[PDB]
Design a protein around this ligand. Sequence first.
Ligand SMILES: CS(=O)(=O)c1cc(NS(=O)(=O)c2cc(Br)ccc2O)cc(S(F)(F)(F)(F)F)c1
Length: 302
Amino acid sequence: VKPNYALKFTLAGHTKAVSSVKFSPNGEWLASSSADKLIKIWGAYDGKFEKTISGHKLGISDVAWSSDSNLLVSASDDKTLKIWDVSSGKCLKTLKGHSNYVFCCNFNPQSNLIVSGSFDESVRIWDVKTGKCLKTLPAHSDPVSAVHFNRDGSLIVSSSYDGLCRIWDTASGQCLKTLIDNPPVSFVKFSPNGKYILAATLDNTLKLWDYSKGKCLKTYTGHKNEKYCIFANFSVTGGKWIVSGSEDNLVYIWNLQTKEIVQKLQGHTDVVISTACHPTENIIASAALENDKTIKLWKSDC
Ligand SMILES: CS(=O)(=O)c1cc(NS(=O)(=O)c2cc(Br)ccc2O)cc(S(F)(F)(F)(F)F)c1
């Protein structure tokens, strides 16, 4: 069994490299962030540009949605995060504390907390309602490349160019596990069931780990990833797929269990820096760097 993803829309508008794309939890919207300091909102099913959200002073590396699809958080080189009301475009809060670029961000499932990681090598946990920093974790010894809450928010996983992945107890901020040769870890996230973590390293390798056992369950290879923080995803709506961008301008799709490449999506004209999987439909969003600057939407039958 193989997917048959086909190009449906090319979304243009960002004026610099795109950095991240995320589908709203209710499936209705795609949000994109860019080095052009802008967030853009697009319709997930017709590709129609909806709006631009501006306010950050420098480029944006990441955006994430609240669970009710009403709020966005953005992480910027201006050392802040911003909480936005998607409906109004208004900045509700500016999260200040990091001493250097904020690279990654995420709400917890409750969406009362935000987790952030920064070039300043720290992970921060923030109160959505007040905008106050609740905890600062001395998480890593190099820039933090990704932060992600597990299925119920009990745990955070972080990745860093220092070569480490770490599991943190959200409530206490204590490091429960450190996964340890150490190529830079450019991305990480929890699996759908919360038992595994998917980590990308800058040696063209994706790895599925049982972090409790410290055992590598799966390895996915064949793509190019030696430089950039490139998101990876679990595709849960049809076939069980792993999806990632690549520095050879392609979208790679692997069979979760067999690790075989089942599809490569051709079309972008620069590094595919970010991919996202729609929560209910077999739809992928892909986004590329500044020779391209577009987002593409792809649809599969399975
Ligand atoms: C038995 S299975 O085929 O259902 C299976 C489920 C998981 N669980 S998971 O990664 O969280 C996950 C991924 C995706 Br995509 C969709 C749903 C989902 O639950 C992991 C594996 S493994 F990859 F660990 F054993 F090596 F093959 C196998």
